Amino acid sequence: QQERDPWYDWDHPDLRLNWGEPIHWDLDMYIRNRVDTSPTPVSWNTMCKHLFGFVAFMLFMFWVGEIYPSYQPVGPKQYPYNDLYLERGGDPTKEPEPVVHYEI
Amino acid sequence: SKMELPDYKQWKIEGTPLETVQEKLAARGLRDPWGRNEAWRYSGGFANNVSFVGALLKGFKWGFAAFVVAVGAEYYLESQ
Amino acid sequence: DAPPLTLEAIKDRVLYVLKLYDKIDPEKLSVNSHFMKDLGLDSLDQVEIIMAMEDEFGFEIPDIDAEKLMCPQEIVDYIADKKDVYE
Amino acid sequence: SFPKYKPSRLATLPATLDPAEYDISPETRKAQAERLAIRSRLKREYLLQYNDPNRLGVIEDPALIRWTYARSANIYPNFRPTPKTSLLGALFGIGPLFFWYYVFKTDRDKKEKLIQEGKLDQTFNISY
Amino acid sequence: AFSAPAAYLTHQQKVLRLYKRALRHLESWCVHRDKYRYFACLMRARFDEHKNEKDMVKATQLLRQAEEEFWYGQHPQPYIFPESPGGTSYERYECYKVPEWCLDDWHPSEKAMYPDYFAKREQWKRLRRESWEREVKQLQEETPPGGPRTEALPPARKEGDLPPLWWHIVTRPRERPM
Amino acid sequence: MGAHLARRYLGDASKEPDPLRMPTFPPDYGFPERKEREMVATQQEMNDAQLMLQQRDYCAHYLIQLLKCKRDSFPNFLACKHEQHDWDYCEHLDYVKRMKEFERERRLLQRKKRREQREAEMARG
Amino acid sequence: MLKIIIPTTMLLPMTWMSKHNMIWINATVHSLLISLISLSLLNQLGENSLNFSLTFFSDSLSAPLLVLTTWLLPLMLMASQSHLSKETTTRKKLYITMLILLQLFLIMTFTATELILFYILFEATLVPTLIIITRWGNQTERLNAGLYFLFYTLAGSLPLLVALVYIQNTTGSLNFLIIHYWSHPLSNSWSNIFMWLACIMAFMVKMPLYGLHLWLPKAHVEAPIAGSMVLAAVLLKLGGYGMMRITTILNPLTNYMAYPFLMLSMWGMIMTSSICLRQTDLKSLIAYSSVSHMALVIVAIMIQTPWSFMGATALMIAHGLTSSMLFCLANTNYERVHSRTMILARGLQTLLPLMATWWLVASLTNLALPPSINLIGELFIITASFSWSNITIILMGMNMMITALYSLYMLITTQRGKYTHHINNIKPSFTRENALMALHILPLLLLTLNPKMILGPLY
Amino acid sequence: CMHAFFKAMLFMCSGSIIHSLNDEQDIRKMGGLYKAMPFTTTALIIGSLALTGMPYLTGFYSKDLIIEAVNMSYTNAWALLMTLIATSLTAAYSTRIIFFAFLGKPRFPP
Amino acid sequence: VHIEPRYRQFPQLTRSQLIQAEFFSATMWFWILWRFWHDSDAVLGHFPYPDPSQWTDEELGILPDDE
Amino acid sequence: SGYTPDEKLRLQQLRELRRRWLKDQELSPREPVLPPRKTYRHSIFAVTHVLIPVWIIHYYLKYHVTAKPYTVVERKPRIFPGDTILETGEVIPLMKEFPDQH
Amino acid sequence: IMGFMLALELNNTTYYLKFKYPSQTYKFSNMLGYYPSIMHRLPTYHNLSMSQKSA
Ligand SMILES: CCCCCCCCCCCCCCCCCC(=O)OC[C@H](COP(=O)([O-])OCC(O)COP(=O)([O-])OC[C@@H](COC(=O)CCCCCCCCCCCCCCCCC)OC(=O)CCCCCCCCCCCCCCCCC)OC(=O)CCCCCCCCCCCCCCCCC
Ligand SMILES: CCCCCCCCCCCCCCCCCC(=O)OC[C@H](COP(=O)([O-])OCC[N+](C)(C)C)OC(=O)CCCCCCCCCCCCCCCCC
Ligand SMILES: CCCCCCCC/C=C\CCCCCCCC(=O)O[C@H](COC(=O)CCCCCCC/C=C/CCCCCCCC)COP(=O)(O)OCCN
Ligand SMILES: *P(=O)(O)OCC(C)(C)[C@H](O)C(=O)NCCC(=O)NCCSC(=O)CCCCCCCCCCCCC
């Protein structure tokens, strides 16, 4: 019905149907609120190829950037008290392996 | 009430990009019959409009003066 | 919000556009001036006139109805009927 | 000169690009006139009923009635168990069931084996 | 929408519709008025150059090639008037359109709230009820034995008659009903 | 962003440091006497101030002072500029220490590469 | 329970001795009074049920169903008033008598304390429903619908009778308390498998289960409004109540025999929702939605966890109310235009605002909008199924998406758009219809306010 | 928070333009509004400056810090590049809106 | 206030809206200038970025290659 | 194409009828016949709409919600060095002496 | 600033009396990447077809 002519004086202007004319078997699917088969400016194959290429290229480049990450020329962040052993939930009874940070 | 249409004979394409279009079409051997109906848009208060850089700096003239006055007042208050 | 249209205003605006057309002599132009019989235009000129009216009034005239508007009075009647103007 | 438009099921060919729209025979004009005549007859009947002042109700649509009857009450009498219908019915009605049975059975067997081996994190799971 | 369609579109109608579509899409591409005027003049120059052609086969081939060119070069997002089909304001007021048959289901108190309107409504209803037989007689007299061949309705021949099948066309809801 | 990424990815990744694995060499390797970093704010003080775990670094005392300044002079939020600057400078010093660590790792790796290449040359001839 | 049973057996002579123009008034007033009386059964204990006598007992599962039935009777009476204007006095009294007998049988079925009496009453409910359908249906297919309904139910339930008498002979008693306290594990043998099959298949055919469900669209489409209201709201819950009652003696064999039925129920949810997506009939859409919800209840009962029974009970009550409301709305639209086609009448929001509001509320409750008891039950069932396995979440999610899709699709199709031009008999909504919709919808929101009353005995 | 502020203002300005031009939502028909609608033009310019991150507007205290944090992080290089390109395209479409809506000559009906 | 529609002419403006638009644009630019005068560090940085190439092996603890 | 005489005449008649219909659709000066049947505004709005809900909610919270344990839980205030604990009259001491960083 | 300058240049190029057909990149960008077309026509058609043909 989207493909049907909008300027004609239909008996059902919203459905774009006439009284008495045969009804398509899939009218429930082809209403204007649902699947549209109207012609597009670009061919369906070209649209599918472009969309697939774009998404595949983006995924590939995301994987490449994941295996080649970006960072800064700095060392690991240093935290006191065995890298905050007790603050992160370490067991008070057990003694953690000491972590010592020196000046530079 | 009862808005009156302006006189139609006042619409000329002279001093307008439409006259350049007419010159190009005359050089090509053609003519543009709808020149004036579009030429209403290039006259009156619509004749001149600002550029993009001039639009962003819409109130810089007064803002700069206010900034200068505020800086001077702040320095004077700090001194005294 | 916007002021309502009237028959006189519609006629004035369509005659304004027609007088701004360069292929029509304003002195011999009236509301009953046939575009082809007594104004000497053709199909492309009539299409351009219809498009100019569409641009002027901010709405589209379907091609099924646009091919039959051969008079300024006919254009006025069509616009008034579509816009529900009765005075 | 220009790239050609390739129609698809969901990207159907426009009426201005249809080759048959420019190769018209006198029989095609007769067919178009017959179609217009049928449409005009149906429109006249509908408009008479619609503009009848004494009518109070719904103008029954035989086309709508036929569509509803064919889609619901006319399927089984016109069904023959062809190989195509048999295979499609068997597939679409049995395959998903066995697929889901296999998936759920595998998942539950893995979970039960983990529970029996005592290597599944069941702490704080007191609502089942 | 007000005119009954024909069985087919003639060559002149096809080329005129193509010309209007090409001009509209060119205006969509050429946003500015001077540029649009220049290129519209060029387009009409092309059409006038091909205007005189006695060979209908060659004219049809030119039309087909022009349609292919238009489809390739059309604007992906052409300008559409707001009220036109596909526009941003299309069918916006269809929910406010209520008919007179709904209007006659009102309560007597509601009808008494508007006394003068319903007198004229009753006059219109009487006028409708006094013409239906003449309308149907005129329709059945002028039809061919096979039946209607087009969706065009005859006018009223007599002075006291009304054009057949006029009620809903005349009493259709206003374009801005509320 | 930087030239280190280009050096590591389009050059000798063995000579360039690995951020996720450094430091590799012992902290005392090349430092005859190295001083352990000093923490001013105590664990109890940080816990009472309710600093976020990412904010409980060696610059926590300046953050505590900034928070105390901001809370006390509430209506005048344009007050603790000195405390904000002190905290920012402490964080800047921490960052430059991290940069020093990275550079030390880089040149220690390149020195190891030079030493092993010299050893290979000696073994060959 | 006699304080509720006797007033129905007094509704019968009152209906048959009342005046010709007072039958509806008397029946409605006294049905409302009986519902108010039956509201007292909600005061359940926490450990054991209410044992009134050797024959009748009430539990936290029985009480909400009894209240639902006693509340549903007057609404059916109002709908019957709607569609039975031109019937004769004797036939109207017979219709009211059928409704009263059905309600009495349902009450006794829900409050029965033994499995054989439960079976007798649960089969006794067939006669009034069959008579109502095949006598006051409007179309030709009512006879076929009645035949399908009756024979599906009986083919399901006869092996249940054989299994029940066998169980009584083997164990000693069919009393529910005894078979719960004296329950013993069921070994994994062919005989036990077939006994399990007998009982479960009976209740699943009643439920219904996907693949055994065609009788449901056939009967619900062709039944009158009262028949559709009682079929969808209460008669579908007999299978769920029976399964929640009969599974006490089927463990641990239920842990092994539940796979085919679980897969059938989940794929049936999916398939019936997809069918709802493309239905040209409104009543068929509502019937298939009912099938999907009952399949979800089946999944909950089969997984059989304490969080699944509460969800099952809540979903049963909520679905009963929602389906009754949807059927009432569809019947109003049908009575306006005399056709069940969904796309025939449009613009009903423009033509009837209050009915558009009722449609919106009913469709929102259908798609389980929080914090409605529909969503409460569905969420409990989904959580229990997730604990059971971690792909049931995928199946439930897609089912929920399709459910929302078809609910809003039917709402938009019926209410929104441009009204049909040639349909000029859309009269304003009646006070009776508006009150019917309000009485359907308000208890749902009140149960949302107080949800612990419909969460079963495992709360 | 900042985006809520300036995005709501931008939508209000667009709605004012649409209402003033008789339900017209096309920049190809908008034009001359810099002098036609002074206050709307000022508000839309300020909103577009805040949207693109003018160094001391509402969008500066969020977008600038976000970009700085993305730069100095152990993140995906492709994600960082796409973020920078997205910022450039944000400036680009703000320029498109301003240019096609307020600058130039009128294109609306007479 | 009442504004008469214009046909093919520049619309009728108002002194109030003109002065308000100019005032708010001036306010925005004044705020930007005032903030940049006081908080130029937020845009141009505050602390110098160290050059790793200028750090000595002695302070970085790098021994001579002979060891 | 163009308007045939029949089409033109029918259009003229329909236009006449439609315009008359719209003129009838106009209303009369008397037409709506109804049945016979700011500091003050802001003050009356502020007392009810603001003052009554706040009273009700404060009463509900202070005597019903806070009558049960753990219903209202407040994150404990931040304690900084060099502070005064008001509950027990305590003094939380200062930190160490900061090494100057310039 | 780079985006500002490039957008302003490409917008100023629209005043020239030169007309060229659109590019593949322009068609991709204006058509929303073809995502609404493909993903709103294909899955919906297949689901609504299997809902009627199969179930
Ligand atoms: C599967 C691929 C997956 C790719 C994934 C990755 C995607 C990356 C995207 C990169 C950016 C794309 C830019 C927009 C492209 C679309 C343009 C468009 O449609 O314009 C129409 C639209 C106006 O349309 P209209 O007014 O309605 O009229 C349309 C015409 O009638 C008719 O219009 P037209 O068609 O004649 O005009 C379009 C024309 C003119 O537009 C442009 O040239 C746009 C790009 C400008 C130059 C950008 C690069 C130069 C500047 C940066 C240089 C390096 C700096 C390094 C250092 C940075 C830090 C200091 O462009 C072309 O013809 C080709 C452009 C190719 C762009 C590259 C990406 C797509 C390649 C696809 C393969 C096929 C290419 C050939 C075309 C198709 C086959 C024939 O243009 C605009 O509104 C402005 C567009 C330009 C905005 C530029 C903003 C800045 C961009 C980023 C600069 C760098 C920032 C910092 C990055 C980080 C540094 C660390
Ligand atoms: C002590 C007397 C002072 C002079 C008279 C003041 C007016 C008379 C009334 C007494 C006011 C007492 C001071 C209050 C704060 C005044 C403003 C101020 O100091 O701002 C500081 C700060 C501004 O300070 P600053 O940080 O900008 O200062 C910078 C200073 N330099 C630049 C020099 C470094 O502003 C605020 O804190 C903003 C306050 C916003 C208030 C919003 C409205 C609240 C409305 C409440 C409604 C409900 C009421 C009832 C509630 C209960 C339920 C019923
Ligand atoms: C290797 C990668 C596989 C990927 C699968 C992709 C999907 C393809 C599989 C499903 C496609 C449909 C196949 C089954 C449907 C039958 C096809 C059919 O209808 O053919 C009939 C004729 O029947 C046949 O030709 C049969 C050929 C295929 C038979 C396949 C083997 C049979 C499988 C037996 C098992 C059936 C039960 C399966 C489910 C059991 C439970 C899991 C006539 O076809 P027409 O439409 O009239 O002509 C169109 C010509 N193009
Ligand atoms: P009027 O009634 O005066 O009569 C004029 C017509 C044309 C009807 C003639 O009477 C006629 O039929 N003449 C002979 C037939 C003929 O002229 N055929 C060829 C004309 S079509 C043609 O030549 C079009 C080619 C140029 C236009 C192509 C359009 C492509 C541009 C698309 C651009 C879209 C985006 C910019």
* DSSP structure string for chain J: ----HHHHHHHHHHHHHHHHHHHHHS--TT--------HHHHHHHHIIIIIHHHHHHHHHIIIIITTSTTSS--PPPP--SSEEETTTTEEEPP--PPPP--
CA distance linking residue I33 with residue B70, whole number of Å: 11
Q: Residues for chain G: how many in total?
A: 459
Residue with tokens 């009828």: J17
Chains C and B touch (3+ CB pairs under 8 A): yes
Contacts for G103 with CB less than 8 Å, ≥ 6 apart: G8, G69, G70, G73
Residue of K nearest to H54 (CA): K1
Ligand 4 close to Cβ of residue E10 (< 6 A): no
What gap in Å lies between CA C10 and CA J46, rounded to an integer?
53
> F19–H71: do the CB atoms touch at under 8 Å?
no
Amino acid at D73: A
Contacts of J60-68 spanning 24+ positions with Cβ under 8 A? none
Q: Distances in Å between the alpha carbon of C43 and those of C47, C49, E14? A: 6, 10, 12
Resolution reading in Å: 3.1
Query: Vertex G123, ends G120 and G126: CA angle to 5°?
Result: 145
Q: Indicate which technique resolved this structure.
A: cryo-EM
- Ligand 2 pocket by C-beta < 6 Å: which residues? F 75-78; J 54
Would you tell me the crossing angle of helices G237-246 and G115-124 to the nearest 10 degrees? 170
Closest Cβ opposite residue E84 in set C43, C51, C60: C60
Look at phi and psi of residue G175 and say left if phi exceeds 0, alpha if psi is from -120 to 50, else beta.
beta
Minimum-distance ligand to the CA of E26? 4
Half-sphere exposure at residue G389, Cβ-oriented, CA atoms within 13 angstroms? 24
Nearest to B58 by CA among D60, A10, C86, I28: I28
Two tokens, residue E17: 């519709």
**Separation of alpha carbons G74 and G11, rounded Å:** 12
Q: How far apart are CA G166 and CA G214, in angstroms?
A: 30
The CA distance from A104 to the nearest CA of chain I, in Å, is 7
End-to-end alpha carbon distance in chain D: 69
Q: Which helix (H) or strand (E) holds G59?
A: none
Whether the upstream peptide bond of residue G443 has omega within 30° of 0, thus cis, is no
Show Cβ contacts of residue J49 under 8 Å, excluding neighbours closer than 6 positions. Answer: none
**Mutation test residue for ligand 3: of D87, D88, D94, D97, the one with most atoms within 8 Å of CB:** D87
CB neighbour burial string for H20-58, b if at least 16 within 10 angstroms, e if fewer: bbeebebbbbbbbbbbbbbbbbbbbbbbbbbbbbbbbbb
Which of D61, C63, F22, D104 has its CA nearest to residue G262?
D104
- What is the DSSP secondary structure assignment for residue C42, as one 8-state letter? -
Q: Chains with ≥3 Cβ pairs under 8 A against D?
A: A, E, G, K
**∠ CA B39-B43-B48, rounded to 5°:** 120
Nearest CB partner across the interface for J22, out of C67, C74, C84: C84
Q: Minimal Cα–Cα distance from C1 to chain E, Å? A: 12
Q: Which residues pair with I52 in a beta bridge?
A: none
Residues of G (333-392) whose Cβ lies below 8 Å from E: 349-351
Report which protein residue has its CA nearest ligand 4's atom 4: C43
Q: Helix, strand or coil for residue G126? A: helix
What is the full DSSP assignment across G320-388?
HHHHHHHHHHHHHHHHHHS--BTTTS--HHHH-HHHHHHHHHHHHHHTT-TTSHHHHHHHHHHHHHHHH
Closest CB to A73 among I52, I60, I61: I52
Tell me which of E15, E17, E27, E67 to substitute to probe ligand 4's pocket, judged by most ligand atoms within 8 Å of the beta carbon.
E15
Tokens of H38: 């002074």
Q: Residues near ligand 3 with C-beta < 6 Å?
A: D 83-84, 87-88, 90-91, 94-95, 98
Instruction: Report which secondary-structure segment, H or E, holds A93.
Output: none
Q: How far is C19 from chain B (nearest CA, A)?
A: 8
Which residue is listed with tokens 């007999």? Answer: G238
Q: In the 8-state DSSP scheme, what is residue B35?
A: H
Tell me the C-alpha distance between F9 and D101, whole Å: 49
**Coil, strand or helix: which one is I65?**
coil
Give yes or no for a contact between B40 and I5, defined as CB atoms under 8 angstroms apart: no
Q: Which amino acid is at G62?
A: S
- Return the residue in K51, K52, K53, K54 with the most chain G beta carbons within 10 A, the one to mutate for interface testing: K51
Q: Residue F63: name the closest of F44, F97, F89, F99 by CA.
A: F89
Which residues pair with residue H75 across a beta bridge? A70
Q: In terms of Cα–Cα distance, which of G58, G62, G63, G38 is closest to G48?
A: G58
D72 and G275 Cβ atoms separated by less than 8 Å: no
3-state secondary structure of G49: coil
Q: What is the DSSP string of K1-55?
A: -HHHHHHHHHHHGGGSS---PPPHHHHHHHTGGGHHHHHHHHHHHHHHHHHHHT-
